[PDB]
Each structure stands twice: as structure tokens, then as C-alpha cells.
Amino acid sequence: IKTLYNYYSEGPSTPIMPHLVNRLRGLDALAKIDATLTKVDMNAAYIFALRPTFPYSYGYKQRFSNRRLTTSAVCYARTGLSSFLTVNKTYTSNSPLKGGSRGWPIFNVGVSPHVAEPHMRTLSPIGLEVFSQNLATFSKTLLTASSKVFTQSLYTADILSIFGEVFLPHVMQPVSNYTPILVRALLALIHILGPGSGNCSLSSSIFESSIPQFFTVSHSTNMSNRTRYCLHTWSAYKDMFRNGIPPQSTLPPTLAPEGSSARVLIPAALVTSPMFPWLLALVSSGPQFFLYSKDASINTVDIGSRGRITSPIPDVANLDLHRLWNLFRFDGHRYIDVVIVGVDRDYVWPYQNGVYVHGGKGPNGTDNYGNADVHDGIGTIFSSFNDNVNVQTSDLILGLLTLWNHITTTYATEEEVTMAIKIAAAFALVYPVQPIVYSGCPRAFQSHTSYYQPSSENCYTTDTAEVKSTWDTVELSVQVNNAMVLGMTLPFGQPTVSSAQWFNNIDKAEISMFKVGNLPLQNLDYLSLDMMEFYAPTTGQLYDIRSDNLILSAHRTVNLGIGYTALADFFAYLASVPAQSFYHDRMVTSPISKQTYSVYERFIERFVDDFVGWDRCDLFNLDTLLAAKRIAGVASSPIPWHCSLQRCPLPIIMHYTGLHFGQEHITVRDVEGLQQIVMRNDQGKIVVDALGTAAPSRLAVKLDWSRLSAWYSDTTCAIPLSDRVMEIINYAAIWDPTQERRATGFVYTYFSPNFLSSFNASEPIFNTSINLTPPYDDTTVIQNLSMPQMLSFDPYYESTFYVVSADNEWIPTSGPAWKVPYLENVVKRSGRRLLAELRIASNNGSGDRTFLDDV
Amino acid sequence: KTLYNYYSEGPSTPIMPHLVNRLRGLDALAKIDATLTKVDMNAAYIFALRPTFPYSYGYKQRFSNRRLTTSAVCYARTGLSSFLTVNKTYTSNSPLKGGSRGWPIFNVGVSPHVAEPHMRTLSPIGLEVFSQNLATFSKTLLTASSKVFTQSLYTADILSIFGEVFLPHVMQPVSNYTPILVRALLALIHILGPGSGNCSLSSSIFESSIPQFFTVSHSTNMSNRTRYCLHTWSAYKDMFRNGIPPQSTLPGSSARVLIPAALVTSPMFPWLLALVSSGPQFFLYSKDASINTVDIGSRGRITSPIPDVANLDLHRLWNLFRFDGHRYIDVVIVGVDRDYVWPYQNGVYVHGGKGPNGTDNYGNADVHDGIGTIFSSFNDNVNVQTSDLILGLLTLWNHITTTYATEEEVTMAIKIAAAFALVYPVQPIVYSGCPRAFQSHTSYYQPSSENCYTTDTAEVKSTWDTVELSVQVNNAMVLGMTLPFGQPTVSSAQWFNNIDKAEISMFKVGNLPLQNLDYLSLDMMEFYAPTTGQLYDIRSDNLILSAHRTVNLGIGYTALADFFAYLASVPAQSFYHDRMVTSPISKQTYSVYERFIERFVDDFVGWDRCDLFNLDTLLAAKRIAGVASSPIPWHCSLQRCPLPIIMHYTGLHFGQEHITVRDVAGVEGLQQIVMRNDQGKIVVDALGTAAPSRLAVKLDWSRLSAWYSDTTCAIPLSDRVMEIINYAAIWDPTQERRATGFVYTYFSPNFLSSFNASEPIFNTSINLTPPYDDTSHTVIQNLSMPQMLSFDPYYESTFYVVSADNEWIPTSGPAWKVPYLENVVKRSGRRLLAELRIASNNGSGDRTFLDDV
Structure with missing residues (x-):
């Protein structure tokens, strides 16, 4: 019902969580109906689904502008690492590389x-x-559905014996749930392809x-979460x-799934399906293999401060491009008995x-x-997953696309898919360390x-063609x-x-023993019973084009992850x-x-x-936060703790919260x-004697959210480059009486x-011909x-500080006297406009103001 | 309404709605009677691409017994119909009379x-x-419905192969064809050439x-070619x-078009591979420039071919x-055998x-670079008659408009193509x-x-x-040529x-939307029902009538x-080569x-502005090295069309009733x-009149017309x-002097002199010299447009029209030759002849007998 215009028009209300949750629900509903995912080209629908772009219009104001052309x-905006660039496995030489990490983080997820x-x-x-067999004494009239017309099918009497022997609980209580495998499928697709903004390095x-x-x-025994497989008829x-x-023994049925010693019943006609290797995955422990980009030279690009695009980054030779899958x-x-039904004694593994x-x-x-041989890892079988195997993106995702197409159409309901999207949004994206610049x-x-x-702090760039920022x-x-x-974070x-290294x-x-979260196990009994047509299908459809396809679902979880x-x-x-409470030295710098x-x-x-409806401790914990170690010879920058955990820019936060930071909050x-x-000092001489305005309290912002809008554009200045x-600094400072200095x-x-500069393109494609130069560039x-400064510098203690003038001739209540930014969200992507800010002198005569004043 | 109603009305205070409604009404009056296209192709071309805009003019002095016009x-006509450059084989360095050493490339990108x-x-x-894939099945491995599970979901055993391919578009049937119609209109207009007939600097x-x-002509370095792959x-x-x-996948294969074998042999096919590719894959020239080019003298004499036409090339606007x-297109061709021969x-x-x-x-699926490799009609050195090069475009436009497109798409295409329809030279400006x-x-x-350049030596050249x-x-x-x-x-290019x-350069002059070839394949494989009967405008199905509409719209623009x-x-100096170095x-x-x-x-247009007009090319000027700006004040507005056309489109009136006695x-x-000077001596003390402000003109539009009567003088020739200048000057308080x-x-x-002909045809027999008048x-x-009412874009100040010696009083009115203009309704002789041929004496047989419909 609501549209982006309605959401951008309205702001926060005093109950924030009842407001923010409803806004996020509405944004997800909008993300459901957005098209641009089926008819479009393949690697444009993928890029629109996994790398969403948030429009916004910037701008800053000055005090005394004379014919100022802006x-x-x-x-x-876009945020989120799409991949990770590390040094190749055969580098040696123990030397730094321009953008090549020596190792990558591992966000290990446990079992819920x-x-x-x-x-x-x-x-x-x-x-x-x-059910009639198990419920009543035997009679020939009870046998009403079985037949021997079709040979070696799922409709004879031996299948009946199987159902009555190893699946009695599910005959008595027909029940199923499929959100774990859907979560794993969404995460697999997202990590293989890579969501975010396209940034692929530290x-x-x-x-x-x-x-x-x-x-x-690629295969690596030391650092692979492999699981054991046995194959039987x-x-x-x-x-x-x-x-x-x-x-x-896996003979007894399972109602509450347990980690080890599982089993699945696979019909022979479905072993050959391309979805089978992906179905053995997404329920096993992963990753059993590592996925790299075939070439890191024709895929990675460099972006300058001014928008210059250099395709081969300086050290293409000794770099690997890990997907988020790794x-x-x-x-x-950890152990799966794959049992094939309807197979003779000369099956041959395909x-x-x-x-x-x-x-x-x-x-x-x-x-x-x-012999019931046990195979360690999914790469020892399923020849598509052997070591050094080169795969095309279509020949690797297809099975996934098949699997999601079946379960969401034949086996699962819409509520399970929604729960899967909400849960998978918690592990959808990876963000680098937060950089800050103390003025x-x-x-x-x-x-x-x-x-x-x-x-x-944490300000790292590798481009050398253009000027490097001093920060x-x-x-x-x-x-x-x-x-x-040790500084990357999750949503x-x-x-x-x-x-890993x-x-x-x-x-x-x-x-480590501590995990970033936990995920539920998939009961393989439900899978097996559905795959033998023991349950009635949920829908008679064949395609998920009109209802919850894989690409639209993944787009929804990426949107929800960015919203999180x-x-x-x-x-x-x-x-x-x-922000410094989430760095590597968070556990020793301060209690x-x-x-x-x-x-x-x-x-x-x-x-x-x-909002999510799942157990909170499975999605977020303090275990990894409290298990910080600190490297050794890394010192903290001398910066006061005055900024929050900003991971995505201000426009995304305003999109997902309704924060308004336009030019109506700038005082003139x-x-x-x-x-x-x-x-005064020890000699009794006044040494400050300066005007100041009290920073608002969080209660005042709670009763009036325009106080936060005005607090921004009062402490915000444009960041210089050279x-x-x-x-x-020339006009204002922060005065905290409770501090010693x-x-x-x-x-x-x-x-x-x-x-x-990467934000200039409307789509995250940068090869050579994309123009990333700033619009109408003059100098x-x-x-x-960056989000305003915190309204309090202590998590529990409430005290008032001030913004204090520093020169003499600036009155803080007359409005800021510097380059004061302002922002808007903007739905319709418009073109560049050359505007002029002038003085009002009662003789201001312009053609547009004279003749175009009708509307 | 008619032209008599529009010539009797002027601008109003809300001026944007007035101008937009006037332009819409003038668009509604662009009729060329499509029947004419079946009898007189050349007359239809002339009437469609070179509008006439008749007007009346005169001069008026105060105390002279001389008899003037x-x-x-x-x-009056506007625009460049073609371009004249030096030929490719020209080796010498000496300049040629009228032959440029290179032409601009108005590059358009993808919107x-x-x-x-x-x-x-x-x-x-x-x-x-659609009703198939929507049906409820029960999977079950006995039947084939289960093949979406045991086999990849892109299977063709439940649907057909075509149904599997077109499944996303069958689920959402949508189409749009303005991107190809825009290119068709642009191709026709640029090949034939609109405007006045001027074809050089x-x-x-x-x-x-x-x-x-x-x-x-083929050029490896200059052509913007695309790769084609032909299969079955x-x-x-x-x-x-x-x-x-x-x-379709990434790598050619960037686009795919499905063509039934019965449609490949149509003349529209080569122009269908074009108009969706990137152009121009080949360059077009006039065959022999020695017979299509003339020189017009000061008095109107049309001379022999150009003095150095043997070393010149007549580029079309296509180039x-x-x-x-x-950039990559897969031509598929469906319904053909294994012995198919490329025709x-x-x-x-x-x-x-x-x-x-x-x-x-x-x-082998060989890749062909450029539309010139295939389609031998577009080979390197091929002489092509006009009719058989435009027939494909006409057939393509008619088929697409009457089968696959709607009226809204055609109108949008016309309005978008009107923005890139005409090319104008630098604006020449004099200074008294x-x-x-x-x-x-x-x-x-x-x-x-400034920028006053003529090359005729048969008559006396003007001093300007x-x-x-x-x-x-x-x-x-x-680098001073401009779009509408x-x-x-x-x-x-050179x-x-x-x-x-x-x-x-990376800065384009505009952008055009890309054409989705999936809609093309769906329509040409008859998966969509044709949109027949959704064209309520009778001019939208021809192309020549449509091209006339966009040419008129571009002149209006x-x-x-x-x-x-x-x-x-x-x-006017904000559009020269030194627009960025002169002054901010x-x-x-x-x-x-x-x-x-x-x-x-x-x-009016309804399309995104950034596709039709940016400031990118304006802000990236190069200024050259050794060209010095003339000492002229920046008092002249940007103008490329003469005054009569401007007052035709805007409704301004500049008659003789605004001249005072x-x-x-x-x-x-x-x-x-x-x-007063330093010691207090008065040194000027002159009489003057206050130039009107834009506010006063907004509340009274006649004040501008009188303004034109107060500062306009007929330009002398020798x-x-x-x-x-003998009576008046401009006094600007905001200027140091x-x-x-x-x-x-x-x-x-x-x-x-070229305006003395009712139609833009001049070979030798046209008399451009006006007899019995001799005033010219x-x-x-x-x-020209009158003097700019403000010399500061932001702040309004009052300047004056001042007397030179106080003998002449500014209130008494001008003492020089004051011109006056009027828009007139006057059809040409050939237009009336065509009207007689197609309406009065039209027998046909399909209109005498097939009139019951």
C-alpha cells in the first residue's frame, strides 16, 4: 500500500521500535513487489538483487556566498563487502601487497x-x-492405493513396508519444516555471488x-568443515x-534433529537431478570446499579519489579473490547415510x-x-566439486535454482520462506572495520x-593514480x-x-570455541518423506516465477540485512x-x-x-565481543570516543529509519x-569566556525528533581532502565540564x-567506460x-556538554559558519542541476524567478 | 485552429503554458497528406524536411524621400542540411573555399x-x-511434470522450447518500441537532411x-561498429x-533476436539490425558534390559548381x-534448414x-564486425539510389507502428527525436x-x-x-555548432x-533509451497479439509525415x-569555443x-531532461590556442533561427505599428x-530613455516589441x-566605461538571398534576385532578437538608450532605417500543385470504391 514517497515523507515517532519494526516490514513488503528480476538480463537481475543502491541528494551551505555555483x-550509497582479496597460496617473500590481506575472518556458526x-x-x-495399516487390524480392503503396474516405483508394497517400518512417527503425526535448508540455500547463493557495494578488499x-x-x-583438509558420507542401497x-x-545407527526416526548420525532416503530417479549435490549440502557442515574467482585481474578494479578507473590493480599476480563462501x-x-530406494545390485555411483x-x-x-565406505567431504564424491575444478556461474547455481524452486513450491509454505529470509538476513553481509577522522x-x-x-583510524586506501587523502x-x-x-562485523x-591463513x-x-551465531538443523526425515511423495504437495504449481523465486527471495534477505x-x-x-568498542582492542582499552x-x-x-521471531541468542551474542585478544604492537589512535557504530552511510540509515537531515534544520x-x-587559572585571569549552546539530551530527542536533526548540521563539517x-575547528569546539580537560x-x-566516487554510478559496474567523476566538477x-556526535559519552551516566564558540565574532545561535552538509533520500533518480546561491538584495532579477514562477 | 488564429495572438503572462500549448497546436497543424508520398517522393521530402515559414518585411525611415521596401x-529556413569537408585524398595544407578540415561528432550515449x-x-x-504453466500438477515421477525436479528447472518437456524461453515474458507481457522509432526518425532525417539547404560553414x-x-564508406578508426553472430x-x-x-549471457551474445525465415527476406531486415545497434557503422556521402552544391551571391546570383569542389566531400548528417x-547481437533465424544460404x-x-x-x-559461429560486412548493400564503395535506401526504413516504420506499437510510443519517439534533429553553425554576430x-x-x-563567413566571389562580399x-x-x-x-x-573527426x-570525449551531448530485443523477438514470433487499431493519428503510420512532425518540433525547440x-x-558568446576561459x-x-x-x-516532452540536455559539453570547452575573441560586448542573446521563425513559434509581434513618430x-x-569628472565638471549630460525590465515585459508583452523598434537598425552591406550609431548608443551604469x-x-x-525562393531548390534557373526593388x-x-534586457543573469539593473548629440530626442523615435516584420500565411506554388494533384484530381480507385470501410 505505502510507497517510497510516503516512507521518505514521514519521520520517527516517540516509540521507535514499534515504528522502526513497522517501517522495516513495509520496506520488505515494497521489496516483494519491485519487478526488475525476471525479464531483465541475467547478470543485471543478479546485480540488482544482490547489490541494491540507495539514492540520495547531497549538498552543503555556506554563510556568505556571492554567486556560488553548486x-x-x-x-x-551501497555497502557491504562483495568478496575478499587475500594473498595467493604460493606468495612467500613475506612482503606487503597493495590490498592483499594475509588472512581472512571466519564467521563460524554453530548448531542451535x-x-x-x-x-x-x-x-x-x-x-x-x-495410516490405515498402522491404525487397524489387517484386511485386504485396507490395501487401497498400492499397485504393481509400475515396476520399481514408489507405489508398491515394499515402499509401504518402508513407510510402516522407519517412518511410523511421521505417519501418525504428518509434520514438516523446511526453514533451515532455505536459510542455507539463501546464504550459499548470497556468499557465492557476493552482496553489497562491490568493494572486495580491506x-x-x-x-x-x-x-x-x-x-x-579448492580443497584444504586443515581448514574445511567436512562431513562424512556413506552410500547404501x-x-x-x-x-x-x-x-x-x-x-x-541411524535406524530410529528423528523428531528433534541431532547433529551427528543422520540419514536421508533418496529415490533413484532423483539422484541424477542437479539439485542432489546441493541438497546434500545446505544440510551438512560447511564449507567443505573453497570457491575462488578464476581470474582476479579481469574482475577486480581500482577507483581513484576523483573517479579514475584503473582495471589491473598493481599486484594482480599474487592475489586471490575469495568469495564470501570462504x-x-x-x-x-556430520555423518549422513544416503540410502537409495528402487535400485538393484549393480547401481554404479553416477x-x-x-x-x-x-x-x-x-x-x-x-x-x-x-563395504560401507565412509567418504570424508562432499568433494570425494560429486565430481563437480573436486579440487581445481573450473565452473561457470550458470553450471554451479542451477542446481540451487532447481532446489529452491521445488521446496518453495511443493514442500514448504510461505511462512517458512519468510522466516528463512529473516534469519538469513543476520548473516547476509560482512562489513570492514569502521574508519574515523578526529578533527x-x-x-x-x-x-x-x-x-x-x-x-x-582504520583509513586504508591503495589507489596511487590520483591524490591520496591525507586522512x-x-x-x-x-x-x-x-x-x-579482527575488526569486521556482521549486520x-x-x-x-x-x-584462516x-x-x-x-x-x-x-x-575458537565461541561462535557468532547458531542455525537450526534440517530434519532429513521430512526431506526423505517429501521426496518419496509420502506427503501431499502444498501447491500444484511447477514454477516459482509468480511467487517467491530464489532471486527475489535473496534480494529480500539482502535488503533485510542492510536494514539490520x-x-x-x-x-x-x-x-x-x-565505535572503538568494536575494534580489536575493545576488551582492554576501557572497562x-x-x-x-x-x-x-x-x-x-x-x-x-x-520482528524476526527467532531466538535472539542464535542471531546475536556477546561471546565474540567479550573474547577480544588485541594483537600486540598496535596502538590506538588518540581519538575521543564520540562516534557510534556507523557501518553504512547516513542516507541508508535515513532510508531505514526516517531520519530527516535536509536544509530546513540549518539555522541562518x-x-x-x-x-x-x-x-580562570591559578592567577585569577579568565581564559575561556566563550559563548556556548547545550547539546540536547536523549529525552529531548525522544519528545522531539527534530532536535536530533538540528544537532546534525550543528556539529557536522565537510571533510577536507588535501x-x-x-x-x-576555526569556530566551534566540544566543552565537557565533567572531563578533567x-x-x-x-x-x-x-x-x-x-x-x-564509486557511488556515482547507478549500478555497481566499473570496468573502463563508467564515468565516476563528480558532477559538474569545477575545482x-x-x-x-557520519551520523552526529553522541548525545552522551557514557553508556549510563547522563551529563550535559556544550558546543562552544572559539573565535569571538561567531554566535552559536546564529547558525553554523562553515560548510554545513544536508541530505535527502530522493526516489526518482534525476540528473545534474547547476544551482546558484546568491545574496538577497531586493534587486535580484533572474529570468527563471520572473517568468517560471507560475508553478 | 489555423495559422490565421495563431498569427493574431501573442504571448501571455503565464508564458510556459502558453508556449507549450502553442507548440502542441502547431504540431497539430503538421499535415502533408500521406497520399502525396505515393505519387511524389521528392516533393514529399522537400515539404517534410525543409519547412518554409513565409513572412513579410519592410523598412521605415522618418525624413527621407527615398523609396524603400x-x-x-x-x-525563412534554419539548420544545416549537410556538411562540406575536404576529401580524404586532400594532401595540401592550403585552405579550401567552404571546405572544413573536419566535422563534429554529436555523440549520444545509452540512457x-x-x-x-x-x-x-x-x-x-x-x-x-500461460494457462499451461499456471495449471496445477501433481509431480510424481511417473509423468513428465516431475522433470522440473529430476532435471534442471529450465526444461522444455512440460512447456515447449519456445514456451520455456519466453516464460518470463509470457508471465508478464509488456513491450515498448520508442527506442527503435527514435533511431528510425533520426536515420531518415540525417540521411536526407533537414533545414535550409546550407551545407558548409x-x-x-x-x-x-x-x-x-x-x-x-568504411572507416575502421571512426565507425562505431557492433559484432553480429548468425546461427539457425x-x-x-x-x-x-x-x-x-x-x-542472454554476458559475452557476440549481449542481445538476441529471433526472426522467422519469412521475415528475413523483407527489405526492413538490414535496417532492423541497424537502429538497435551502435552507429554509424558506415559513413554516407553525396555521390558527386559537383552537382548538388551551389553558391548564392549577395544579390541572388546562383553560380557554377563550387570553385574547389573537386577536393570536397559532401557528408550527410548521418556522419x-x-x-x-x-554491441553484440545474435541473429538466430528460426524455421530454416541446414542448407540455408545467407541472402x-x-x-x-x-x-x-x-x-x-x-x-x-x-x-562455426563466425563473428562479423560491423553491419557493413554482412548486407552487401552497405559495403565499402557502393552507390545507392535514395529510394532503395529509404524503402527499408519506410517498411520498418510502417510495420512496427501498425503492428507492434501504440500512438503514445510514436508521439514520444517524435518528441525525443526532435531534440537531435537539426545541426546549426556558429552564431554570427556583428557590432555597430x-x-x-x-x-x-x-x-x-x-x-x-564574429563568425561571419561567406565564400562567394561572383558578387561583392559584405563588409561584415x-x-x-x-x-x-x-x-x-x-566547436561552436549546437543542437536545437x-x-x-x-x-x-578528421x-x-x-x-x-x-x-x-566522455561527455556526451545526450542519451537515447536502449531497445529491448526480447520484445522484438516476441512480436516477430507471434507470441504477442498484434496491436492493430491502436493508432488514432493518421500521420503516425507513414514515417515521412512523422519525420515532418519531428522536424517541425525541432525547429520549435x-x-x-x-x-x-x-x-x-x-x-551568444556562452556557446563559443572560449565560453569557459572568457569569464565565469x-x-x-x-x-x-x-x-x-x-x-x-x-x-512538453515528458522524458528525462538529463537525456535531452545537459551542461556537460558546455562546461568542457577547449578554447583552442590562437583564436582571439572579437571586441564585442555580451549584449546579444543566443539565437540560431531568424526572427520570423521565432515569432511564428512564440507569437511575438514586430509590426510597423510599434514605431513612433x-x-x-x-x-x-x-x-x-x-x-562628472574628478574636479566636478559635467562631461556627458545627455538625454536617454530607460530600457524596459523583464518584470515590465512580463506585465506588458508589447513593451518588448516597442523595444525592438527602438534599438534595431538595418545592417548596411558595403x-x-x-x-x-549616428544617433544613439547604450549607457550601461554597471560597465566601467x-x-x-x-x-x-x-x-x-x-x-x-536564399530566402527569396518558396522552396529550397536552387540550380541555375531560380531567380533569387528581387526585381523592381533594388533596396537589398x-x-x-x-x-536578430532585440538587445538583451539584462547584462547580469542574477541582479537586475537599469541601463539606458542614450542620445549621441542631443539633437535627436529618444522619445521622438528612431531616425534610422527601422525594420518591421510580420508572419504571413502564404503557401508555395509547388505545395498548391501537390495539393491539387493529391486531392482535386485523385482518382485512385481504392478511395472511390473502398470507401465503405
């Missing part, structure tokens, strides 16, 4: 103790007859030109349970040569193989500060590499303490959670990190229960909100000039999308 | 906006597939008529697993544009068709200088001229034409000394753009010109202008002294 244009609640189902005509300059078309499969599998119960670890079933099914064809012409303090307060010099002063050493590797802000000729992984990130950033600027985590988890736990004219701040001196500056989480500002 | 009739597709109804096969070279023979349906199916993907379309080029083998040496089932009495109060004292076409001057004049909305170019080179530039006070005021004027254009485009008795309406003269835009005596032999004409 450009009103539209940019497109909670079980997804199954919903009712109805039996097939054959299933109802099994440096904000290297991007990914487009979605890759060719992958390579139904006859041999049943025969192995005759002379007692062997150890690790940055995630999932725990599923996929991998040298693999023999127990009870099938033997090695050399023999029949009824008598310093005015020279007037040089003697009243502990943080005088400007500084920067970016990060050199990729081993210690800095590890410190930033809810959870870090990871598990890492593959170089020289050695692969080594450190997986934006709302988490908003909650960070609701509980006064500093207030736990206090901040308390309020942050209070916000998150209320959001998850009100003027009754007494001012206060004179007086300070010099480390801001135009806000009461003056400070502004922290301003800072993305990049290259990153924002040194890096754009401010 | 009073009610003469002329016919990010996609034209919105409207609903379509499925054909019985499409409806079968010089205003004396003209095209004799619309050309009848073209020559193709059976061979195209076997490339993939067993069926072809619903969405002056660059479009970005699909358009020898040596071209279709994949799965006939092989090289009489073989069958050709196994200043009266001698103000010699010590001026910075621009000497009279001068002083341009010597050197290399730097050639480059500066080339005023967009110049920074790209160029084919000299057998060396061809194109400089294409440029007239309204000039009028907006006057309204927004945009100097150019961008300040752009900041209002953009608002005017954006309002007009958002109120007024024996002066009192002091009403006069001001005293004083300049002397650089304008009689207005406040005294200044008058500028005006000056076209040429030859360009106005000394005074040329003044077809």
Missing part, C-alpha cells in the same frame, strides 16, 4: 539448541493407506567490476541392521569414478558390494585538551593486518575471533555505543565496553523478538539558549573519497556521511 | 532510464503457454536539392545443454552523429546452414561600434564582427564577412591525407530555446538556461544621464557604419 545531483516448529501436513493416498579503493562468471574449487542398508544394532563456517550434520555404493556394483565387475581542537583551546592534534595513513603490516582482520555488529604452502585455521545494519547503527546512536554492550544487546534483543537567522562559559584542517573536537566516521571535500 | 515577402513498457495481450500460443554554399544518390534455430539450440537460456546501441552477402556462412565449399550444417561623441567613454568603440578559414579558426567554428537546445560538441581519426535564452539573458558569467547564465529548458522538457513637446518619458553600441545577430546577404543592394535585413 551541483545538485543524485548518488547511490532450538528446533524449528513443524506445521501440519496431509498424507498422500498411499500415505493414508499406511582497502576502500579496490572494487569488483561485476558478479563473477567463473569459479575455481535400501536392501543393504536394511540388511546391516539384522544381526543387532551396530554403533552409530568467510563463513556452518555446522550441520558422479564420481571409484566410488561404490554399499549393496551396488563392486569395484571390478562384482555385484552387491559389501582536532581549535588553537584557542590548545591548553585545555587531551586530544589536540587531528588523527585518523588515509594506514600501512598494511602484519600487525595492522591482523588488527583490522548486528558481532565480530569474529576465528581466522593460506600462504607459503601452508593452510592453517584458528577456530542500519537499525543496528541507529541503536548505537541510541545507547551511546562507541565500559561491557556496560555499552548491555544497552546494545537490550536494543537488539527487543528488535529481534519483535536567530531567544536565549546561549550560555557564557568562564574559566589538508587536515577542518572549517568547523574539558575541550575536544569531532570524530566523524569517514568512509573514503574513492568509496564515494577538495570528501563528503560527510 | 515596404511589404516584401521572404521564406540509464528505461522506457516504461505497457501491457500486451498474449497470442493463442502465448495464452496456451560558409553561409553562401547551399544544397541544390535533396540528394538522389549516396556513396557508402536448430544450431542455436545445440550451443547450450539442450535449450537456450531465458536471459555527424554517434549513437550507442547493442545478403556472398561468403557469409550461417552457423548451421550452408558451408563454404557446398557443405551442410556449418559448424559606438558614436564618436562617446569615444572617451567606451571599451568597445570600433565596429566588428571577414573570417579567414584557417586551421585554428576552423576548429573554433567547428543549444548543446555544443567536444568530439570531432579524414585528411588518407588518415582517419576520431576524438570522442530551437526557436523556444532562443526565446528562453533571451528571457534568461544568456549571451557563462556558468551563471547556464544556471538559469537550465531551469528554462528543464521546465519546458518536463512540461511623436513630435516631442514635453519631458515625459525622458531621463538625464550625467557623468560600409561598417550603421545609422543608429558606460557607453556601448549595438550587437545584433547577422546571418548573411547570401543566406537571405545596400541594406541587408535585421532578423
